């Protein structure tokens, strides 16, 4: 028989090697119903690569062999054939297609009916399989693209098929399949987890490493973590292999005075003897300790192995009849190993590099920060206390407006909490001068949030008051040209969720792209032009403007807050301008807060004199800092330019000075000014 | 000889594995009488796809093998070539055009003359049919859209041919067609189905479903109702399987306990062999019961069998012109197998519980509601309850204006009540103060007459002043601006058949507005400025206003409704607004339906709470109440931001204590205010 | 000033990135490289005599051009002007030094 | 293909885990080996546009390995490596 390429799932499904599925069972039965639907048949599932719709093939196999299924398919048998290993018979189609037709005929010559789950069934693209008229049955799973690629360019094949979804489950359904595996895997590892851990890093994963999708991600994460503490445990400890380089140096310098003959040899000698003595004497209890765990793990995984072995041989009795066997087995080796199991786990409680054999979630934040080169620091916080400071804690990163920074606060607090729409994420649309540190707000408001500069977009509205210019942006249904480009707004949404959304120039806007994100602030996703709405629960979205600054006096007043307000009732649908969080406003900037900011300009200044060796002692007069101020203040960017003009009119000179070293090691920057001139002055002429 | 690629249909007929096909008779007269002509004998369809236009071509080959022939085509042969896969499968297009060269060459080899369906035949192009009008046919179908991108632009292929058109399936069309196919699939399914069941089922299945097309999309729905029902039946009952696996397990218990020597193990296994003769002598009766019912369902089903066989061997003695053993089959099995079926009828009914062979409409309705979202308890009324109950269900919605509901639900009853112009759906002028829940009352009715918000889209008339305004609305041709979206009314009703019509605040649309959209709804229809058909007889539509506020004083009277429908008529053409069917009057909230309004959103906020287990209970005090009415009374719009002044009032300070703990789950938020700005009295200190 | 913005988008990346992204998502190292464009505009503001005045009409000349952040990116601005008379003869004797070197 | 297995099938003649580190895996791809997962074990390593050609294109191997890249070593660990090859290659060239 050419079994070949095929692969009997029921073979290992009575055999018990498949891992235990979970969740997920009303698709089992609407799989059902489509084989045993009649017209079309075939079970042509879809979804996202690497979730394993696999383990949905079999654990629908597994549910199949224990015969609780569709009566006129029980007695049918399920297998799998890579469809790359049968064109892995020959190079050309051409002698391929004979290998392929004795596919098709040896199944159709098979007196018992089974059926073959094509996985990647695409791949049939590189036919024959026109024999499906009921005498035969399949099943269908790939990505979406190449199914609207190749599939629905086919009428007559797919007139007889019918997609099927794969929704991605979510946090709880994960807590699911990982507490269900746990046992599993810490069998192959023979190890012990914590819950609290696994329900971290399964988030943790969620959160950050993202490039994949849940849940296999977080399981190969538990993997790793776990592989990590095996490997520690399976080594000797540090202690151990520090004794034992040390013995093997001591007995070197035994013998080696053995060989010379002298009183200092022979002192050296005797007590190199007693080094050796001591630490062989210690290492014994602490070496034969960790023999002992050894045996102790040991015994635990050959007695799991027994254990399990007997359990599904039993279970495969139980399904046959072998009453007598069955009972006597069952009720004789399942308690004495129950027993084995208990007093090992009484003797390692007992024991007590010591290791606990438990893993921790420390380990996983170690591992994701050596995923991602993220501080460990900021993870282990629970996104709590961080909002009970983040006002205070951004204040401190600028400042201007109090006001807007605790309302943004309260606005996200409101989400977390979920004492809102839960689906339609807060949304941000400012107004006021620039300078301030509108764009770096939002900065701070990321790299706090979610920690990491990326995580913010650009958004500018000119770029963008094109209809087509609109079709662009978000790209345009495989069928246009847009299909080389696709949207960079929907494609970062794809890549990373969990990030932050800009936008600007929005009174320059196209109205139907203004719609859309409308629709996005009401939908919390998109349906993109291909069919993949994906969620932007994860994200925050800001708008900006200046238009009513123009009001702005240096002063607050809710006269000018109702100017603008109509000023932008104006502008926009209300409705629309219903979907802010809140109107987000701005102020005009007393020179207080400026010169402040300047204290935090020399201070970024020896920050970065600190980023080096180089001790360098800013002296900003207090004039010095006023007539800065006073200056750079710029009426349509404030301190944006004043910023680069500190920085040419100091950084000039000190590095002058720098590159001279008149001004050397330990030495002060004395920031002086020369009437109405700032002008730092150097300690020394050449 | 390759017709590998082709299946001959003509077989198939005689195969009669085919299911006879109705309606388009006249259709099939058409292209029968195009295909006795010699001008251009080589027809296309124009087909809408999805329409199974296969069933039509296969109905074509049916009446072909029967004599319903003109004598010209006596013995042609309709085949079936895959061209999809024969055209897309090939990697390189040699093979391709090879194929395609020998497949024609072999055309030509015409031992007995056929005539191949082919389809998409613009695929064909991407000019080989070099001689299609000579010795050869062409079985045409298609869109128009194809026709026209492809076909009108090359002129001797296209003028080859004809053009022939079948049109989307009436409702009576797919009654019968289901009427017949409700025999094949019993036959094949071994279960009952509901006249009725499958009237209202076709129904919905119109109602929704636009994505897909009628009539085929009814019948698979049919068939996996069909198969859930056949899965139903395939499983034995639930209590059964549970009784026997307690059965299993008891049998596994007496062999372990009878190998025990102790009173409290015999005592138990004289039970559990007592148990297990219980349960027996409980199943076995159903169990025998189930078996038997599914030996009638069997005989049934090969009774069936044998009389489709035997009757299509009687029809092919007939084509042989066997009429005295074809009449000896017919009076000897056939009314015998009729009697067959009566007893088996008899029988089953003389059985009657557990499982049932017929299919309730429910069924097919819990398919169609995953596959919409929504309880047949909204997709039973027909428009009926919906009436009979629409005061009242839209009063639970909102209230204070009864009036205006009043006469919203009297005119809509009289538009489901068939007698009211039909044509010309009822439309409606909101006019009244603002932020009365105007847009929620819209809202309200869109959702009430479909349960789905996409039935109702945006229109605001203040965009909506000007001609220009008119031409974007109404579309425009290739020529004018209001054109390259088309235009946002048409194409908003170029998607629905069913759906009302927002016109917001149209004291704002200009004269000419009124007077282009009396075009449209004097029979709820125009013809649309980019050039299509239109018509929206099912949909409806609804003006709104707001200048009879200014008329309203704080406690509707038609003394000052007098003045104000004087003001409307003087401002909008009174023969335009007789087409009003109801002026939608309004009156000042008065502080009682307010407090009812905000207790209501209290209510959404309350069971937000239970939308997740952190869950404790609002308490607003009669105070709070009434003062934060009165405090976000927009006597400008009424209290239309008075929600966002709740919710930011409380709702922040609420999440406040409750992320920091200080009133845990379950308890009260009492809103009690203190000094006119209530406080969220906390309960858990520092 | 002749570019396509979306080529000035990619560069003011590179000025802002230290690297670049390319069709295959890789990032190369530039910053141990620097970068050169130019511009003739002033040339109507060109009149010898250094003047601030016309430096602000050729900035807000560029304002309207590029990005003002984009513009700020930047490390420094840079000026040119005409030649003197001398130090136009002065070059000349640099070419005849050329010569006599060839 | 029948060398390869019969040295495939030599590694399943084993006394100890045997363990088979590959470079260029590419070179098998542009599946064989798709016997028996626990029997065989290499370690992977090209460049990474071999990576996107022929490593993510098959399914299964893009569910049997794991990537690991190779940051380009720094300076001062320049130094410090080539400080231990000195000494050898001094040993070898005694200057």
């Given at each position: 028989n050419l079994s070949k390429f095929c692969i009997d799932m029921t073979a290992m499904a009575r055999e018990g090697k498949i891992d235990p599925v979970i969740g997920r069972e009303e698709e089992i039965r609407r799989v059902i119903r489509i084989l045993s639907r009649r017209t079309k048949n075939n079970p042509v599932l879809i979804g996202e690569p690497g979730v394993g719709k696999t383990t949905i093939v079999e654990g629908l196999a597994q549910r199949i062999v224990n015969a609780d299924v569709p009566d006129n398919l029980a007695a049918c048998k399920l297998l799998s054939l890579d469809v790359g290993a049968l064109v892995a018979g020959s190079k050309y189609r051409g002698e391929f297609e004979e290998r392929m037709k004795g596919v098709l005929k040896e199944i159709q010559e098979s007196k018992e009916t089974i059926i073959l789950f094509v996985d990647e069934i695409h791949l049939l693209m590189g036919l024959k399989p026109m024999l499906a008229r009921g005498q035969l049955h399949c099943i269908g799973a790939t990505t979406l693209a190449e199914y609207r690629k190749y599939i629905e360019k086919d009428a007559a094949f797919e007139r007889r098929f019918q997609q099927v979804l794969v929704k991605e489950p979510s946090i709880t359904e994960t807590i699911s399949i990982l507490r269900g595996l746990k046992e599993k895997y810490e069998v192959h590892h023979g190890v012990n987890i914590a819950d609290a851990a696994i329900v971290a890093a399964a988030n943790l994963a969620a959160r950050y490493l993202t490039s994949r999708r849940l849940p296999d991600s977080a399981v190969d994460l538990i993997d790793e973590a776990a592989a990590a503490v095996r490997v520690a445990r399976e080594s000797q400890p540090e202690i151990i292999d520090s004794l034992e380089r040390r013995l093997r140096q001591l007995k070197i310098e035994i013998h080696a005075l053995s060989r010379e003959k002298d009183e200092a040899s022979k002192a050296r000698l005797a007590q190199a003897k007693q080094d050796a003595q001591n630490v062989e004497e210690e290492l014994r209890p602490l070496r034969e300790k960790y023999e002992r765990e050894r045996q102790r793990g040991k015994a635990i995984q050959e007695a799991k192995m027994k254990l399990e072995a007997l359990r599904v041989k039993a279970e495969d009795a139980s399904r046959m009849g072998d009453h007598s066997r069955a009972a006597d087995l069952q009720y004789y080796a399942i308690p004495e190993q129950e027993a084995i199991i208990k007093r090992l786990e009484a003797e390692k409680a007992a024991a007590?590099?010591?290791?606990?054999d438990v893993v921790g979630p420390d380990q996983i934040n170690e591992i994701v920060a050596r995923w991602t080169g993220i501080p460990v620091t900021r993870l282990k916080t629970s996104e709590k206390e961080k909002l009970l400071h983040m006002e205070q804690a951004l204040s401190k990163i600028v400042v201007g407006q109090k006001e807007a920074v605790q309302s943004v606060s309260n606005a996200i607090r409101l989400q977390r909490s979920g004492l809102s729409n839960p689906n339609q994420p807060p949304s941000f649309l400012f107004c006021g001068p620039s300078g301030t540190g509108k764009t770096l707000l939002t900065k701070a408001l990321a790299e706090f949030l979610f920690d990491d500069p990326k995580s913010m977009i650009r958004f500018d509205m000119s770029e963008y008051q094109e209809r087509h210019s609109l079709s662009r942006m978000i790209g345009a249904p495989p069928g246009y040209v847009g299909h080389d480009a696709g949207g960079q707004l929907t494609e970062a949404l794809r890549r990373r969720p969990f990030s932050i959304l800009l936008f600007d120039e929005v009174e320059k806007a196209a109205k139907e792209v203004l719609t859309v994100l409308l629709q996005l602030m009401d939908d919390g996703r998109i349906t993109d032009g291909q069919g993949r709405v994906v969620d932007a629960k994860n994200c925050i979205v800001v708008m900006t403007s200046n238009l009513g600054a123009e009001y702005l006096s240096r002063a607050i007043d809710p006269t000018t807050r109702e100017l603008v307000m109509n000023t932008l009732r104006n502008y926009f649908l209300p409705e629309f301008l219903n979907r802010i969080s809140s109107i987000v406003i701005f102020n005009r900037l007393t020179r207080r807060e400026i010169r402040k900011i300047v204290d935090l300009r020399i201070a970024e200044i020896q920050k970065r004199l600190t980023d080096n060796d180089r001790n360098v002692t800013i002296k900003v007069s207090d004039e010095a800092k006023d007539k800065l101020g006073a200056q750079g203040y710029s009426p349509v960017y404030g301190a944006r330019p004043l910023q680069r003009l500190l920085e040419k009119e100091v950084l000039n000179r000190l590095a002058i000075l720098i590159l001279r070293g008149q001004i050397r090691e330990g030495e002060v920057a004395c920031v002086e000014l020369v009437d109405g001139k700032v002008q730092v002055l150097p300690n020394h002429p050449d």
């Open positions: 007590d590099s010591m290791i606990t």
